[PDB]
RNA sequence: CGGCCCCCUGGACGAAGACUGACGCUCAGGUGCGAAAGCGUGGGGAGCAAACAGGAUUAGAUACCCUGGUAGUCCACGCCGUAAACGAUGUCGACUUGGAGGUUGUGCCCUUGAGGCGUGGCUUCCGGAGCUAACGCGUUAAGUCGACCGCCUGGGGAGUAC
RNA sequence: GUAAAGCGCACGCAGGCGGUUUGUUAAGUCAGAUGUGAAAUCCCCGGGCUCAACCUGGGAACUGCAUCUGAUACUGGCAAG
């Protein structure tokens, strides 16, 4: 039921007395096609093991997101370290207008319709984190009604 | 292996090997998903048990909390909506619809027993309409019992039992302040009407004294053929206690009670005398 | 259940100095006496009662309780408390990642159990002396570390702690996993990670004992229930 | 309610700062630490050497009560300054009692003049005296039976520096530190001073009215450099020391202990 | 900006009151002050010391080290207008958890003692939330905001040429 | 702050911004109307060339400007505090 996308894999080095020890980092993200989403960032000497780790980590520490039907509930900004991200709810049919790692996380999240730009850095890791942050902070109408002591129709 | 390493709380396994094997399992809330692990990739491990000892209809239910959630889970795989309860023998009265009852009941002698041991006790599969039918068969009776409780005038009793929930059968132990909201509550009298019901219960206990509280008949007189409990009480009210004491009485002595006729008292005296005389023979 | 007079007698109301406090504890502080913080018993008592009730409820559903104190003043007492209600405890140094990294520690438990078995049930003696001394030393080490939690099986369903600042590693582990935390929190301590905070003197022995005894009683009650 | 506020001020009313109210009940003994609870934030890590009397064995079991001392709070965890200092207040009260009748009567046995004046000891403690006070007259207890028993009749006290000199015999007979710092000066006046803190080059014995002495590291013993003062003397103990040197200007009285 | 004294003189802070009644903040151009070195004229010249000379060192030593040593450093009056002129942090105002100090006021308190409880100004260190690329900053912000100005737009060429 | 980037520091004209209360005005601001904002082009609904491009009817738009009539919270002006 869960869908999982390996966003990126990158070779990283550690210099030692002999020479360079190489290793691989795997950035993955998983989601159930609904609110729930989680990213994982694994590391191992070989690629498949590292992606396996990324999947494992993503599977835990997931996070829920309040989706109005296929899209978002309102325009939302999210940042992390360099990657600053804007994403905006959009009409059915438009699809996921987003670039790169961001796209991936959106798809697994089960959002189908967004207009979305990544300002600043586009370092996959940071940008996916920023996306997750923007999705988490985003609140729903019912939530704001509760926050504020009102009905949904009062807020419209 | 999760179950083996204490990750899948498995209590009872009410299953019928050789047919259906539905069993519920609990888990410590930690993103474990018990049934999921028991099933696997597209019933990966589920297929193993399916063709393990033999073609069995194995099923897993996501145990929620306590026994109330175990009831519905024991009705799976189907569609439960509601259920009734009681004391020691609660008897989970399955409440579903005829359309969904076909699958819920599945087989007369299969899912009615497999789901019976599910909770460990026993279940009574019923219908949505059946529930309501029996539901009302309870409102009238704390009333449907010749009204042997409080009692005063009847015109006020109808207007009181209109708003009255669960009649008045032992309702004094409930909120004694919401009936005062009723249009007509001066001095504590309705709070007193409920007290009358309590007195009626004591009166019912006095009726038990009339049938036990004042020494009712022995086992020989009660198990005599051709006599009921009321007839045995009416016969024993004249000082008799045993079947031999009833045999000592005559038709004219038993004729003082209008409940027994001369032919019936003669037949009872003859039966008691035959039981006394032919007691050596079984 | 636990009265205010008794707590006063114990020395709960006493709290750390005025240069060592935490401003998140400002609500729970009453005043400062001789340049020492005083804990507000009025606000402490009801919450302590609450915490007790929650612990009881946990027990009722057959919850596993872990008692943590590594202050080495009240290690004996916390062990005693754990045993009274036959629950589990960590009276010596908490192993980093005991709960988060359970699966590894579970092997540790198993090795300890095996060693215990060898010691007692085997009755095999005839072991090379040095080797026998080494095995004994290993046994002692593992008993000290994991004695209370050896029969635990899996992960606790609640975590009682005697000091938050001292056992912050355990607290953090519980939070990461989501286990309910029941902490005694002095003025210097940080109660943010704690779910059911308890403002009381972690340091004083008698106060610690009192805390423990009430907790044990309510666990026993929940078990009885 | 105000129950608690009233109690807080009540409990203020029923404790004081110094070691005055004998309140701490000994709730655990083990060698070498005694511990009490005087209604303080924590229990005191008491030495055994505050609580053995005059021949080297302990005297108080569980439940026993002595007050300790205060006005210093939490070096990182704990509570007190020790209780024998409390005993010093009782000794001061006994010494003051003399004033009432102009005669304090105890036993005082002064064999030899440490710093000019015979040393007189009251039951547990031993104090040092100025010369004249040991004897009312030139009697000179050197010819008396050693460590003899008479009494103490006060000749001289310094009144800020705990130097008290007393008259053992003859029952019939009956800013501030630094301007005139020439009393313990001349070359070699020995003193009885409690050490305060050993700074790994020193010991800091300093008793005589708000001064500071250093017996640092060189004398201390009859080994020079491998000594490490903490091993060789004590913490918080009254010792043999004398001046050897005074600055009145740069306030460095450089005492010694090899004497 | 550092020995004391005197004369003339600017600012800061606190204590209470009394008064004025938005008179304020910022500031392109403009004006002033602006280390050291440097320039001009006139004085002065102990020590130190660019330049210079000799002796060493060295492969060489137009240096480092040594022996000397003149401009200058000092004073007066002018000019110069730059420095890692740095907190590499524009000015003004408001708001946001804490601890340990220093310094300088001031109110009360038995100053019963060097103290006890406050309340102002300036100031050093540590550290929370938050912020930050991180380092770190953290009520003296590099946090949360407002007003005005200054400045940046790849490295070199170049802060150079005209 | 360290990546390029806080004038060495100040005073200060012009300029920018401006505590709080009441009154007034109605400049800014907002609302409505009128006039205009060529046609074509763009966009919406239609029509015609077999379709399309293309042609084409009607609308919308042309974010503006000018006026007149209102609104007066805020900003401004004026008057008193």
UniProtKB/Swiss-Prot annotation, chain A:
Disulfide bonds: none
Description of how the protein assembles with itself and partners: Part of the 30S ribosomal subunit. Contacts proteins uS4 and uS8. With proteins uS4 and uS5 encircles the mRNA as it enters the ribosome, which may play a role in mRNA helicase processivity. Can be cross-linked to mRNA. In collided ribosomes contacts ribosome rescue factor SmrB.
SUPFAM superfamilies per record: dsRNA-binding domain-like, Ribosomal protein S5 domain 2-like
Annotated InterPro entries: Ribosomal_Su5_D2-typ_SF, Ribosomal_uS5, Ribosomal_uS5_bac-type, Ribosomal_uS5_C, Ribosomal_uS5_N, Ribosomal_uS5_N_CS, Ribsml_uS5_D2-typ_fold_subgr
UniProt note: domains: The N-terminal domain interacts with the head of the 30S subunit; the C-terminal domain interacts with the body and contacts protein uS4. The interaction surface between uS4 and uS5 is involved in control of translational fidelity.
Any one Gene Ontology BP term: maintenance of translational fidelity
Chain's gene name: rpsE
Name of the protein this chain belongs to: Small ribosomal subunit protein uS5
Any one cellular-component term (Gene Ontology): cytoplasm
Keyword rRNA-binding set for record: yes
Keywords, sorted A to Z: Acetylation, Antibiotic resistance, Ribonucleoprotein, Ribosomal protein, RNA-binding, rRNA-binding
One Pfam family here: Ribosomal_S5_C
Family that this chain belongs to: Belongs to the universal ribosomal protein uS5 family.
Task of the protein: With uS4 and uS12 plays an important role in translational accuracy. Many suppressors of streptomycin-dependent mutants of protein uS12 are found in this protein, some but not all of which decrease translational accuracy (ram, ribosomal ambiguity mutations). Located at the back of the 30S subunit body where it stabilizes the conformation of the head with respect to the body.
Domain S5 DRBM residues, every copy: 2-65
Electron transport found in the keyword field: no
Miscellaneous comment text of the record: Altered uS5 proteins have been identified in a number of mutants. Some mutations in uS5 have been shown to increase translational error frequencies.
UniProt-recorded Gene Ontology molecular function terms: rRNA binding; structural constituent of ribosome
From Swiss-Prot, chain B:
Residues covered by region (2 X 51 AA approximate repeats): 151-276
Predominant place of localization: cytoplasm
Sequence repeat positions: 151-201, 226-276
An example Gene Ontology molecular-function term: RNA binding
Localization: Cytoplasm
Domain KH: 89-155
Keywords: Cytoplasm, Repeat, RNA-binding, Transcription, Transcription antitermination, Transcription regulation, Transcription termination
Gene Ontology biological-process annotations: DNA-templated transcription termination; transcription antitermination
Gene Ontology CC annotation, any one: cytosol
Stated family: Belongs to the NusA family.
Function of the molecule: Participates in both transcription termination and antitermination.
Complex and partners: Monomer. Binds directly to the core enzyme of the DNA-dependent RNA polymerase and to nascent RNA.
Annotated protein name in UniProt: Transcription termination/antitermination protein NusA
From-to range in the entire protein, with total length: 214 to 495 of 495
Curated annotation (Swiss-Prot), chain D:
PTM statement from Swiss-Prot or TrEMBL: Phosphorylated; probably on a serine.
Modified sites of kind N6-acetyllysine: 190
Transmembrane residue ranges: none
Domain S1 motif: 19-85, 103-169, 188-258
Superkingdom of source: Bacteria
Family designation: Belongs to the bacterial ribosomal protein bS1 family.
Function: Required for translation of most natural mRNAs except for leaderless mRNA. Binds mRNA upstream of the Shine-Dalgarno (SD) sequence and helps it bind to the 30S ribosomal subunit; acts as an RNA chaperone to unfold structured mRNA on the ribosome but is not essential for mRNAs with strong SDs and little 5'-UTR structure, thus it may help fine-tune which mRNAs that are translated. Unwinds dsRNA by binding to transiently formed ssRNA regions; binds about 10 nucleotides. Has a preference for polypyrimidine tracts. Negatively autoregulates its own translation.
Subunit: Part of the 30S ribosomal subunit. Some nascent polypeptide chains are able to cross-link to this protein in situ. Can be cross-linked to mRNA in the ribosome.
Protein name: Small ribosomal subunit protein bS1
The species this protein was found in: Escherichia coli O157:H7
Taxonomic path: Bacteria, Pseudomonadati, Pseudomonadota, Gammaproteobacteria, Enterobacterales
Encoding gene (name): rpsA
């Amino acid at each position: 039921e869960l869908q999982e996308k390996l966003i990126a894999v990158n070779r990283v080095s550690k210099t030692v007395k002999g020479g360079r020890i190489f290793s691989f980092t795997a950035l993955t993200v998983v989601g159930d096609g609904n609110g729930r989403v989680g990213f994982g960032y694994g590391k191992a000497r070989e690629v498949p093991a590292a992606i396996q780790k990324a999947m494992e980590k993503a599977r835990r520490n997931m996070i829920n997101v309040a989706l109005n039907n296929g899209t978002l509930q309102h325009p939302v900004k999210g940042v992390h370290t360099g990657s600053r991200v804007f994403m905006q709810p959009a009409s059915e049919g438009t699809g996921i207008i987003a670039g790169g790692a961001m796209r991936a996380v959106l798809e697994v999240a089960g959002v189908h319709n967004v207009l979305a730009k990544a300002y600043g850095s586009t370092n996959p890791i940071n940008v996916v984190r920023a996306t997750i942050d923007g999705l988490e902070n985003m609140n729903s109408p019912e939530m704001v009604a509760a926050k504020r002591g009102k009905s949904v129709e009062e807020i419209l | 292996p999760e179950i083996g390493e204490e990750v899948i709380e498995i209590k009872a396994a009410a299953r019928d090997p050789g047919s259906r094997a539905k069993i519920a399992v609990k888990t410590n809330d930690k993103r474990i998903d018990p049934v999921g692990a028991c099933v696997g990739m597209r019933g990966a491990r589920v297929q193993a048990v399916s063709t393990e000892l033999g073609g069995e209809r194995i099923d897993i239910v996501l145990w929620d909390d306590n026994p109330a959630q175990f009831v519905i889970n024991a009705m799976a795989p189907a569609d439960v909506a509601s259920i009734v309860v009681d004391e020691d023998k609660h008897t989970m009265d399955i409440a579903v619809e005829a359309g969904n009852l076909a699958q819920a009941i599945g087989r007369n002698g299969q899912n009615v027993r497999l789901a019976s041991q599910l909770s460990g006790w026993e279940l009574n599969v019923m219908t949505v309409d059946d529930l309501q039918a029996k539901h009302q068969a309870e409102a009238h009776a704390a009333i449907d019992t010749f009204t042997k409780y409080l009692d005063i005038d009847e015109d006020f009793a109808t207007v009181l039992v209109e708003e009255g929930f669960s009649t008045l059968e032992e309702l004094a132990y409930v909120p004694m302040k919401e009936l005062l909201e009723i249009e007509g509550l001066d001095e504590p009298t309705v709070e007193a009407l409920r007290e009358r019901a309590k007195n009626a219960l004591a009166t019912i206990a006095q009726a038990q004294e009339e049938s036990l509280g004042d020494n009712k008949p022995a086992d020989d007189l009660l198990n005599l053929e051709g006599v009921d409990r009321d007839l045995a009480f009416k016969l024993a009210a004249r000082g008799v206690c045993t079947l031999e004491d009833l045999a000592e009485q005559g038709i004219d002595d038993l004729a003082d009670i209008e409940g027994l006729t001369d032919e019936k008292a003669g037949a009872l005296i003859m039966a008691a005398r035959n039981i006394c005389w032919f007691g050596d023979e079984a | 259940t636990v009265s205010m007079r008794d707590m006063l007698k114990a020395g709960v109301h006493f709290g750390h100095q005025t240069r060592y406090w935490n401003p998140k504890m400002k609500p729970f502080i009453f005043g400062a006496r001789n340049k020492v913080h005083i804990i507000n018993l009025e606000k402490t008592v009801p919450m302590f009662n609450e915490a007790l009730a929650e612990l009881n409820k946990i027990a009722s559903r057959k919850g596993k309780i872990l008692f943590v104190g590594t202050k080495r003043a009240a290690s004996e007492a916390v062990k005693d408390a754990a045993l009274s209600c036959d629950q589990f405890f960590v009276n010596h140094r908490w192993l980093g990642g005991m709960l988060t990294n359970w699966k590894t520690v579970r092997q540790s438990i198993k090795r300890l159990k095996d060693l215990e078995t060898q010691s007692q049930d085997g009755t095999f003696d005839k072991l090379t002396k040095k080797e026998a001394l080494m095995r004994t030393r290993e046994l002692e080490k593992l008993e000290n570390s994991l004695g209370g939690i050896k029969d635990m099986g899996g992960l606790p369903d609640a975590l009682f702690v005697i000091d938050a600042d001292h056992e912050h590693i355990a607290i953090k582990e519980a939070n990461n996993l989501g286990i309910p935390v029941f902490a005694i929190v002095d003025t210097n301590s940080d109660p943010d990670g704690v779910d059911f905070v308890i403002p009381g003197n972690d340091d004083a022995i008698r106060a610690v004992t009192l805390y423990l005894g009430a907790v044990a009683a309510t666990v026993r009650e929940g078990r009885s229930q | 309610e105000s129950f608690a506020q009233l109690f807080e001020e009540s409990l203020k009313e029923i404790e004081t700062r110094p070691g005055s109210i004998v309140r701490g009940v000994v709730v655990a003994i083990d060698k070498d630490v005694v511990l009490v609870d005087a209604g303080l934030k924590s229990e005191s890590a008491i030495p055994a050497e505050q609580f053995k009397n005059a021949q080297g064995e302990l005297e108080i079991q569980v439940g026993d009560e002595v007050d300790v001392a205060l006005d210093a709070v939490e070096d990182g965890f704990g509570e007190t300054l020790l209780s024998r200092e409390k005993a010093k207040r009782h000794e001061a009260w006994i010494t003051l009692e003399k004033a009432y009748e102009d005669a304090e009567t105890v036993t005082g046995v002064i064999n030899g003049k440490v710093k000019g004046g015979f040393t007189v000891e009251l039951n547990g403690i031993r104090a040092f005296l100025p010369g004249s006070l040991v004897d009312v007259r030139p009697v000179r207890d050197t010819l008396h039976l050693e460590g003899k028993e008479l009494e103490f009749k006060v000749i001289k006290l310094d009144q800020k520096r705990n130097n008290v000199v007393v008259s053992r015999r003859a029952v019939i007979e009956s800013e501030d530190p630094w301007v005139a710092i020439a009393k313990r000066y001349p070359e070699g006046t020995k003193l009885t001073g409690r050490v305060t803190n050993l700074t790994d080059y020193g010991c800091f014995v300093e008793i005589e009215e708000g001064v500071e002495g250093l017996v640092h590291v060189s004398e201390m013993d009859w080994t020079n450099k491998n000594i490490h003062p903490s091993k060789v003397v004590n913490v918080g103990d009254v010792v043999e020391v004398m001046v050897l040197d005074i600055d009145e200007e740069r306030r460095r009285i450089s005492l010694g202990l090899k004497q």
